[PDB]
Design a protein around this ligand. Structure first.
Ligand SMILES: Nc1ncnc2c1ncn2[C@@H]1O[C@H](COP(=O)(O)OP(=O)(O)OP(=O)(O)O)[C@@H](O)[C@H]1O
Ligand SMILES: Nc1ncnc2c1ncn2[C@@H]1O[C@H](COP(=O)(O)OP(=O)(O)OP(=O)(O)O)[C@@H](O)[C@H]1O
Ligand SMILES: [Mg+2]
Ligand SMILES: [Mg+2]
Lengths: 334, 334
């Protein structure tokens, strides 16, 4: 492409000109033009290291080698950054584990903690539906679940989504948390049943029969969905997956489920519930993917489809840390 | 019982005294005291004939013989009334068939008719939920189904019941009406699924596992429910049932289903939908059991349990006629 090289050649000049803005947009626009443009990736990676964003740099070098495996400028930079980010990632998970041990060391009966867990429960439901486009407020959700009376000027669908979540959550907490290691299709179906039961009871708790598009992702064909779910379940209960880091295992479980997209709707909600199940079985608190992180959440998912899950694994880890911060703040406060 | 005979002996005296009130209450109160009091039944039957209520009289004579088969006063009166009401019942069904032929003779495309069918559709849903204790108005139901937005100050359950009905009705009309003669368990499950899906998706479309009380009726034990439903389906598709009068067949189908009470909730609604299916397959319009007829509806059901279904069959026939009157009034008007 002619216009692809134009933007990149314009980008380098601005960088070495001494731009205050830094012409980061010029680089982004180049890869907007052609995202598989090996030269634009490496040079953008080099630019990222100067701003001390080595993880972003490594991502770009990794993406370049999937396109052009024997691109030398990528290969030499990759070999340097490959083990460096491996360390940085490991170090981050140690920082998580430390904050988790602080939370785990607290006794369950602690009165200050249980206040926070009660308040943050309503927040959990808000964010998982809000990220879909649910327009219900926190106080509205509080009113719906406690009173069981509909709020004025809001679709019954949106209000049924809230009830579906609370049902699914109470089910998980009651039944599924107590059994560590072994999970089945039936378990996933029973979560989804309650998630999408009050909205669409016909399709609730069974696989889709039609092919769909999820953002920019094309999941396995309905005929292949069962086969994929059969493999997904095997992976969950495999020794490999047990030996993975809880946060990492929780993340990979999330992605794999939304990748398969076995249901017509409610795949994200159920995946995030399954994510939080995995964590709570491993002794971690249930984490929140906030409403505000929608764009980022989609970008890292898109990145995972193109063949690098690490950004998504980091995103889940970012959320985990943010949760642990919130709990330790409120618990220490009260 | 001493107090049972007291009221009855008091009743006869008042009747033959020449009471303007007629001491009908004295007779009712006697059978309130003891409903299996053979002497009170026969004498109340005799009293009913004087007011030209021979069907009511026959009922009482029939109830007496289940208790005391060889009670002479009942036996002689029964033998007289037995064929008389048989004629009266047959004559009523002829009066129905005539009014049905007037309705059936109208072309489907008729513009005046389709106005009525559209308006009365919302009435159908109102009455079937209103009779349960649903507190939604006609305009509220109209708003819920058209806008799909919840009305202010009404339980989500009540509003989900409305959506459940509309779903079940649209399903029946689309799928089930086109196949005359053959119905399965799966079909009944698929109706109930949509009826109770939006309220309780967990229990929607499957048999209850717990024994319950329905008014004053004890249905078959959960273990026996499947066996009863298996027999119920056989009866529906039997030649006997095809040769029954549509209104009668529709009625018996209703009662048999609510008798079995296979689901935890939503047995009446589904039964009334199945009732109206049977009618529409036989070429009759779907009929309405009004909200106001709740007490009567329960009394005739209780009577059917004690071992005389005829009152219920008449009640359904009464509703059918009332429907046919409403249609022919509105159709002729417009
Ligand atoms: N590019 C992508 N690749 C894989 N999965 C994706 C991608 N984009 C989005 N997803 C996932 O698919 C979900 C959308 O599918 P679906 O509508 O079945 O889920 P939902 O639960 O209805 O929506 P939400 O999770 O927002 O409530 C998203 O929530 C997300 O988790
Ligand atoms: N004595 C009785 N014997 C047999 N069946 C009865 C008796 N009394 C009531 N019923 C039936 O059982 C139904 C009640 O059971 P259930 O609650 O499962 O039905 P529902 O659909 O939830 O209630 P409704 O029909 O009022 O909406 C009544 O609607 C009626 O049709
Ligand atoms: Mg969705
Ligand atoms: Mg009920």
């Amino acid at each position: 492409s002619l216009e692809a090289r134009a933007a990149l050649n314009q980008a380098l000049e601005m960088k070495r000109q001494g731009k205050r803005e830094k012409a980061q947009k010029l680089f982004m626009h180049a890869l907007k033009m052609d995202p598989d443009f090996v030269d634009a990736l490496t040079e953008f990676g080099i630019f990222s290291e100067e701003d001390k964003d080595i993880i972003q740099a490594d991502y770009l070098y990794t993406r370049a080698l999937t396109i052009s495996p024997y691109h030398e400028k990528a290969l030499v930079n990759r070999d340097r950054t490959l083990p460096l980010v491996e360390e940085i990632d490991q170090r981050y998970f140690s920082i998580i584990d430390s904050k988790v041990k602080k939370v785990m060391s607290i006794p369950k009966g602690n009165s200050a903690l249980r206040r926070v867990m009660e308040e943050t429960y309503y927040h959990h439901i808000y964010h998982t539906v809000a990220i879909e486009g649910n327009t219900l407020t926190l106080s509205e959700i509080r009113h719906i679940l406690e009173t069981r009376y509909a709020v004025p000027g809001a679709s019954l669908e949106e209000q049924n989504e809230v009830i579906g979540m609370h049902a699914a959550m109470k089910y998980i907490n009651t039944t599924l948390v107590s059994r560590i290691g072994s999970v089945t299709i039936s378990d996933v179906l029973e979560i989804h049943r309650r998630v999408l039961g009050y909205v669409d009871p016909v399709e609730a708790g069974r696989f889709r029969t039609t092919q769909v598009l999820v953002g920019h992702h094309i999941p396995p064909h309905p005929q292949d969905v069962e086969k994929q779910m059969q493999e997904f379940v095997q992976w969950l209960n495999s020794e490999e997956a047990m030996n993975l880091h809880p946060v990492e295992f929780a993340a990979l479980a999330h992605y794999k489920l939304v990748y398969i997209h076995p249901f017509i709707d409610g795949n994200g909600r159920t995946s995030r519930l399954l994510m939080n199940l995995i964590l709570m079985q491993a002794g971690y608190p249930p984490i929140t993917i906030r409403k505000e992180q929608r764009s980022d959440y989609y970008h890292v998912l898109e990145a995972a489809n193109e063949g690098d899950v690490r950004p998504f694994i980091r995103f889940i880890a970012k959320c985990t840390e943010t949760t642990l911060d919130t709990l330790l703040f409120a618990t220490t406060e009260y």
